[PDB]
Amino acid sequence: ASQTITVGSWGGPGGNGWDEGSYTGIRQIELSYKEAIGSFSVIYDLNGDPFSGPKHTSKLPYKNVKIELKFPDEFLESVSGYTGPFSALATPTPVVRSLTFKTNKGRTFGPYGDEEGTYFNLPIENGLIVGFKGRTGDLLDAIGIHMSL
Amino acid sequence: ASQTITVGSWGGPGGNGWDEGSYTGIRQIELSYKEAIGSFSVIYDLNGDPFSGPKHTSKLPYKNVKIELKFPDEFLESVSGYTGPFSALATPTPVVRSLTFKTNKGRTFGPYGDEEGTYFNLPIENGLIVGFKGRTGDLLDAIGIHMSL
Amino acid sequence: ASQTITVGSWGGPGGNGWDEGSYTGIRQIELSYKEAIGSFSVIYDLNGDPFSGPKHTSKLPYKNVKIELKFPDEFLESVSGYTGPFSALATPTPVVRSLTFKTNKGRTFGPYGDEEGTYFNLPIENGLIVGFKGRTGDLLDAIGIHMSL
Amino acid sequence: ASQTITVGSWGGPGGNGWDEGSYTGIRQIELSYKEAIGSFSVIYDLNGDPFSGPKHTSKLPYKNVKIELKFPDEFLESVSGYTGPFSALATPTPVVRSLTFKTNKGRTFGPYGDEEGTYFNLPIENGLIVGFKGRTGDLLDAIGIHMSL
């Protein structure tokens, strides 16, 4: 490398590309938002210990959140959330306006960003999100995934 | 019982559940369509030789298309769609209304069924659709996918 | 193709190469033996339904045996068995002499052929024997293993 | 909670069981030995940067090798090595007496420890050793491997 299934890249053409790679599973997701998502950073599980993924932090003073999955027993079972521009940041390129997170234990981590734009949805009937791919310019411009069993 | 990453479920809850399991590759898809997708049946590749999976047919007089891939060098890199109910089959439940496939070699087997309702899109950077899962009643009620490296 | 992890070449470079392929799992193994292993063909599982793998039969008038596992619930957790030349077969190269299979339920299919030669050993901790590869000329010149989750 | 294929545990039941877990690849191995293998510590690759796995050290004053593979073009292609007891450590239980590492590039990191006891041979045709698992007490009592595509 060992490779993984990389399903996706939902978002747009600009920003700067970042592939954090692959790990055993997710422990914490922490993002900043207002009308679009700006910051996205994750705390992975690496063989029993926590691993802090690289950060893709925004300069925009957006509203802040921390999603804390209860590890082993809880893992996401669905990722969805629209995509499109934001004439305000004067950025012509498509961008991730929202991004909601469902869980196998039921807990859904409420829509973040305004549900305006075109919808993308990804339900997992069997599998495991194991890492994140995507781009980040001023906000998070595109999002991608890493799957495994 | 070896297992696969089963991604998705896109479509409604009506129809009879079907699963065709996992193979080694896709050799030819066959579908009928007309304002919605009726029949669905894929011919797979089992260890270098062709293996026809179960047929999932509709009695509806729908238009017919044969999608045949050049098998080893060509595979689907994207499956998109629009799932939306259909008041004509008097079906209140959601149904997959359109279906578009895009190849790693550059050919998009143009949108079959009319592009109406909520769009779905699943792009792949490294992975392989290795078996189809789905529901069928009179139309292709739903669509599921299985994956591998 | 999708690929699987292929561990194995145990035996010698002689004979003709055979790769039976990767399937869903194993339902019955069928071999022949005297002083060494001669024929080896298996019945595989192909998505809930049995599937016959090609026969790799040895012309040698040998003792016969059918090993059948209780499918789903019982599966191979171990494979092992002695390899060396056979001055009789006037075979200048090393060939497989004995082969013993151990089960997750306790069942162990007694050494078939003679325990003579250098020994090889594969205990599986997590994983699944999914297809058989190897070489066959008069006897089984060599054996390989396919694996998945 | 993702899994990888773990094969084996070639050794004896003595000592304290350890499992470094899985990563992206093997960059360096560092062991000690005289008549049996004493220390075993590996510097893994995690997504592009080195990640040191835990050290499993041994007080026995042994020779000290430092194995560095050229990480992306070079990876292990086979592991082999003799398992037998060791009268001198006054131990009743089988230990990993010897250990040899072959590479896909051609280099064979010749025998470390004596070639004595029963033999084991893990040869690989397709796949990646992606993590080591095992048991240490005074020396290296057992060794197991993790696999991925």
From TrEMBL, chains A, B, C, D:
GO molecular function: D-glucose binding; D-mannose binding
SMART domains reported for this sequence: Jacalin
Residues passing through the membrane, by range: none
Residues with PTM N-acetylalanine: A1
Stored Pfam families: Jacalin
Domain named Jacalin-type lectin: residues: 4-149
Keywords: Lectin
Keyword ATP-binding tagged: no
Cited InterPro entries: Jacalin-like_lectin_dom (IPR001229), Jacalin-like_lectin_dom_plant (IPR033734), Jacalin-like_lectin_dom_sf (IPR036404)
PANTHER family: JACALIN-RELATED LECTIN 19, JACALIN-RELATED LECTIN 3
Family: Belongs to the jacalin lectin family.
Name of the protein in its database record: Mannose-specific lectin KM+
